[PDB]
Every structure is written in C-alpha cells, then in structure tokens.
C-alpha cells in the first residue's frame, strides 16, 4: 500500500478545477529536464532517409493510475531505449475507470527530453463499450462567451507546469452529432491559437465531419478539417488508423491542402505481435520515391508487455527497432520486418560538452556508486536513464557480443558488456555514438571499465572531416573499486569537433575478452556543486512520510539521499527534481534517530559535500 505522490490523471470536471498549489502531488510530477534541442542524425543506413518522421504511442507505464511520481523499487519497468529513432512520443494512457486526461509522468518526460524527443499527454474519449461517455466530450468542448475553451486552457496550463510538449487527442466515443464535430474543430483551432510555439497537438483519425466515428485510414475529405481548413491550421498532425495498404492518396491530399505529408502518421498496430505484425511497407515507403507519409507505431511497448525479464525485453526492442540483422547499418529490405533503422536515421543529443554517460538504462537490480553497491534493492528511475548508444550494434573484428549488463555497474544499475572471443593479436572495434562535440583546451576523454581477461580497453573518436575513427590508448590511469578509469587529454585537437565515439581492444593469449563499460565522457574539469539547501517538509496525504525540498542548483544532474544504518549508509532515494518523498521516516524516528545525507551530483558526476539532515 503505497502512500507517496502519484502521477496525475483527471476527468474533465476534475481538470476544470485543477490548480498546482492545491494538489500536494503536483510539485512531484514536474519535469525539470528541458527538451534538448538540436539532435544530430547518423548516416549509417543507405536505405534510410530524412523526409519521414516517426511517432510512438507507447504505454511507458502499464497503468494510468497508481504510478509513483519519480520512480519505484521495481527493476522490471518499461525503460524504453530507442528514443534515437523517434521524433515524437505519445504517452499512452487514459481509461473510463481512471481518468481520460493523462499527462506523462515526470520520469519519462525527463528521459524523452534528454534525448530531444517531444512527449505528449493523452486526452482519451473512450469507445462506449469501454465506458466512454459523451458527457466527457461535451464537458471538454464547453465554450465561454469569450469564446475561450476553459478546458483547453487547462490542458495548456498542465503542459506548461509539468513541462511537456503538447497533447494527443483521441475521440473514440460514438454518438457525437455534427454540432459536436464543429465544436471539436473549434477547440482544436483554439489550441493552435493559444499554445506556445513548439507545442504539438496530434489528432486521431476517428471522428469525421458528421460527428460519426468513421476511421478513414487515410487523410480524406471526411477528416481533413481536423488538420487544416483552408488557411486555418486545426492540428499539427494526424495519426491515421491502421486499415490501409497504400498512403499515396494521403500524400496527395496533404500537398493539395498545403500541408506536409509528413504531418500524417500512418498507423501500424504492433501491440499483439510486435515484429510479426504484417505491414505492407511499400504502401508507405514506395520503391524509388519519397516516403508517402510519416509512420505511427501503436504500442511498441509490446517488447515490455510480452516479456518477463529485462534481458528478453531489451532483446525484443533491438529486434523491433534495429531488425533481425542486429546491425542498423546493414538491414534486410526483403524481411517482413526490416526494422526501423531501415527507414529512419538514428538521432543523438550528444551535441554539447560535457557529454557524460554511465550506460544507465533507468532501472536496476541494485544501485552502485563508484563501483560499490550502495543499495541492494531493485529500483527504477527513468530520470536517471542516460543517453544510450546510437548504434545497437556496430562492430568490426573479433567474435564479441554487445549487450547491457545489470550485474555490473559503476554508477547506477547497469553497464555496457562487450564480450566473447578475440584471438591473440586480433583487433576489434565497437562504434557507439554519433556526436557533435567541440574540443577545446582542457577537454579530455575519460572512460571506466573492467576487463576480465586483462585486455586493455582503448577509446575511439571520429573527427569532423574524417571518415575513420582514431583509436588511442589511455594516458592517465586511476583504479576505483576494481574499475579502471583512463583519461586522455584532447588538447592537441582543440578547435576540432568529435563526431563519433567508439572503443577498441586487442586480443591476448587467453583468446577471450569480457569488458564491462561503466562510464564514458568528453569534457573538462568542473567544480563540485554546493551542498544542497534542504528542508524537511510535511507531505499532507501521508503523515507517516516526509518530503525533502531543496533549492534549484545549476549544473546538477541528480540528487542522492543516504540514510545512516548500523550497517553503514544506505541509498534510500534519487531525484532529478527539487524534492523527494520518503516513506516511514516519521515512524522510524520514534524508535531511533534518523540521519540523512543528501548529495548533489554534477553533470560530470562530481558529488557535492553531503547536506546532513536530522529527524528526531
């Protein structure tokens, strides 16, 4: 029975009255990681091109209700890692039983934003069979004498306060009349007029001009007024329903309306079968012509729901997003499932120095700091997911496999494992990231790893204007709790820009190699953050609990909360916000004294002195 703060969900009547200041959970649901602009694209796949976009409609949380605001002590959680092939994320949620207006949770907003992916909340008018009520639709479409739409106003207020990038509007309730159809168009137009620049409103191909639910599976005369009405912009995009074999007609109508065909996202329903979903790909990506429209994936979270282990889940996501060759540079156009990498370049937000990754997948079986366990408990906190490799996977040489590991970690719960056979004297390379990182005096490459058979691990970097990677030995070594950290100063390359990062190794007499790679960074020396200014506050809904609230600090990636025990300290929470809820400490403080230590970790993972807090 969890009594901590939960991610929000509303019915219209609740939303109408919503105010951040009177919702004790609202501060916990705000994302503090802004949408990263300026992603850069790769070019490894000769079939992929730059016209079409990709939206994912993903149940990043399996349920709408009961989602803790900032993570939970559960390893098996949906730690989606293919942000690099998405242009837009729709948070899939909403139900007649729980609530029909659902913002994305803060943890997944942060992950999406770290990767430069805009993420939308959901407005779901359900089919009558699943409890849908026309009443809810009519409520949302109420218009003042203004004639503003107060519920639209609230949608914009929610997006602004929580920090996400718009809304996906899905009208599946039957019985709507033409008046209701017109009111919906007005509501959408009002959003266009009032929303901030950059905000995206996506409409589902369902309710037509008459109000009837009649999915078109294309942009047609019956639904085009929900996208563009003459000179009036109605929506930023349309998600097309699944029953199509060709999208040429949508492309043509889009052009006729003066809209990009790539604002239409042709739906594919992958929920049940994932990569075994039959799709007539040529109807979307014609031979020798531009893609007809963009692509919309409905429920690629199939990889998570149809699996029971983190390993099987990650393997399925690779099969889905990269395809059965397991190499995004080399895809099979004859396959029933060529993979998303066959059509879409991978994008990267490794475009600012310092670029830092610890290959944190956003959950773990245990939590480590500097290679030592600080919590034995399962955890997920997708605000801690790092920017993960652009390429899953590209190697040259040797007989090695690359996978994430949840058995070895330097910071967090995971590392990159690179392992298999490597003959004496042979070399192997693994290319991981597309980047755009300017090198200055004082910039260095650092990387931290374990090597079970004793092979050193060299770093690779590619420079703008060169096609080949430069593989180079580490210069300055430090051993940290069994891990080796190399530093390679890059001053000789000042004025240059790194466009790729990689690793390389040479085989030794054992003929085997087994690396765990726990950290990689391009960046300079930076001061420790100040100890956070922390206050203990009540969390009204739970007398037995507390919240810690600190002042915002610049350049702090996240906060760690440690508790003193007889056993030594224990990590009891992480936060990438301005606070964290902690259960049980009120109770515990009656039996014994509770001392907490809160650290701020900088963007280069330099910890502050801890703030020590007493609870008596």
Q: Residue positions in the annotated binding site for Ca(2+)?
A: 308, 365, 376
Q: Are 45 and 345 contacting, i.e. CB atoms less than 8 angstroms apart?
A: yes
| Alpha-carbon gap, residue 288 to 308, rounded angstroms | 41
| Alpha-carbon gap, residue 254 to 495, rounded angstroms | 45
| Alpha-carbon gap, residue 437 to 123, rounded angstroms | 39
Q: Are 265 and 219 contacting, i.e. CB atoms less than 8 angstroms apart?
A: no
| Closest of 459, 433, 445, 465 to residue 348, by C-alpha | 433
Assess whether the previous peptide bond of 393 is cis (omega < 30° from 0): yes
| Alpha-carbon gap, residue 365 to 602, rounded angstroms | 24
Q: Are 335 and 343 contacting, i.e. CB atoms less than 8 angstroms apart?
A: no
Enumerate long-range contacts of 316-321, CB under 8 Å, 24 or more apart: 316/274, 316/275, 317/80, 317/81, 317/82, 318/392, 319/274, 319/275, 320/82, 320/270, 320/274, 320/275, 321/82, 321/85, 321/392
| Closest of 385, 391, 417 to residue 404, by C-alpha | 417
| Alpha-carbon gap, residue 72 to 573, rounded angstroms | 9
Tokens found for residue 375: 């919590």
The residues facing 44 across adjacent strands are none
| Closest of 549, 570, 552 to residue 561, by C-alpha | 570
Phi, psi of 291 (to 5 degrees): -50, 145
What's the gap between Cα 469 and its chain centre?
28
Instruction: Give, for 599, the enclosing helix (H) or strand (E).
Output: strand 594-602
| Alpha-carbon gap, residue 159 to 194, rounded angstroms | 13
Annotated binding site: 308, 365, 376
């Amino acid at each position: 029975t969890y009594n901590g703060p939960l991610s929000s969900h509303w019915f219209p009547e609740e939303l109408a009255q919503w105010e951040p200041d009177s919702d004790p959970d609202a501060p916990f649901n705000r994302s503090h990681v802004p949408l990263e602009p300026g992603r850069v694209a790769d070019r490894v796949n000769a079939n992929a091109d730059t016209d079409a976009h990709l939206v994912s409609l993903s149940a990043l949380n399996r349920h709408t209700s009961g989602v803790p605001s900032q993570g939970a002590p559960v390893f098996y959680e949906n730690t989606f890692s293919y942000w690099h092939y998405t242009d837009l994320m729709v948070y899939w949620a909403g139900s007649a039983g729980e609530g029909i207006i659902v913002p994305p949770s803060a943890d997944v907003i942060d992950a999406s934003h770290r990767n430069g992916v805009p993420i939308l909340g959901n407005v779901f008018f359900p089919p009558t069979v699943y409890g849908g009520q026309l009443e809810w639709l009519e409520q949302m479409l109420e218009q003042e004498e203004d004639g503003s739409f107060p519920l639209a106003d609230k949608l914009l207020e929610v997006a602004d306060y929580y920090g996400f990038d718009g809304w996906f509007i899905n009208q599946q309730t039957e019985g709507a009349d033409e008046g209701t159809a017109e009111a919906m168009q007005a509501f959408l137009v009002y959003l266009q007029e009032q929303k901030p620049e950059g905000m995206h409103i996506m409409w589902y191909d369902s309710m037509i001009d008459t109000g009837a639910i009649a999915w078109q599976n294309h942009l047609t005369d019956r639904n085009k007024m929900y996208l563009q009405n003459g000179s009036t912009r109605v929506a930023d995009s349309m998600f097309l329903n699944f029953w199509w074999r060709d999208q040429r007609q949508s492309n043509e109508l889009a052009q006729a309306l003066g809209r990009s065909p790539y604002d239409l996202y042709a739906g594919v329903d992958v929920e049940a079968r994932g990569t075994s979903t039959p799709v007539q790909w040529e109807g979307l990506f014609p031979e020798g012509e531009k893609a007809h429209t963009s692509l919309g994936l409905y429920r690629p979270d199939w990889a998570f729901q149809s699996s029971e282990t983190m390993e099987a889940f990650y393997e399925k996501e690779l099969q889905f997003w990269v395809g059965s060759t397991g190499n995004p540079a080399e895809t099979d156009g004859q396959s029933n499932w060529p993979g998303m990498a066959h059509w879409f370049p991978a994008k990267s937000t490794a475009t600012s120095v310092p670029f830092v990754t610890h290959f944190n997948t956003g959950s773990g079986a245990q939590f480590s700091a500097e290679g030592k366990t600080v919590s034995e408990q399962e955890w997920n906190n997708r605000s801690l997911q790092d920017v993960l490799p652009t390429w899953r996977w590209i190697q040259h040489g040797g007989d090695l496999e690359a996978t994430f590991s949840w058995e070895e970690a330097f910071e967090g719960g995971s590392s990159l494992q690179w392992h298999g056979s490597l003959a004496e004297g042979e070399h192997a390379q693994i290319e991981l990231y597309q980047t755009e990182l300017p090198i200055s005096e004082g910039t260095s490459l650092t990387w931290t790893f374990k090597s079970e058979h004793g092979n050193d691990l060299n770093v690779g970097f590619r420079l703008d204007g060169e096609e080949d990677f430069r593989y180079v030995e580490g210069e300055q070594r430090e051993s940290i709790n069994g891990w080796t950290q190399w530093t390679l100063p890059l001053d000789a390359f000042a004025g240059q820009t790194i466009t790729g990062l990689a690793f390389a190794a040479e085989g030794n007499e054992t003929g085997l190699a087994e690396f765990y790679i726990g950290q990689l960074a391009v960046g300079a020396d930076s001061e420790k953050p100040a100890a956070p200014n922390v206050n203990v506050r009540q969390y009204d809904p739970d007398p037995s609990g507390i919240q810690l609230v600190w002042e915002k600090q610049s350049n702090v990636h996240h906060y760690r909360v440690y508790k003193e025990t007889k056993h030594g300290k224990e990590l009891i929470g992480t936060s990438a916000g301005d606070r964290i809820y902690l259960e049980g400490l009120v109770e515990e403080s009656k039996q014994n004294d509770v001392r907490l230590h809160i650290e701020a970790l900088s963007e280069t993972f330099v910890p502050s002195d801890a703030r020590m807090i007493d609870i008596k």
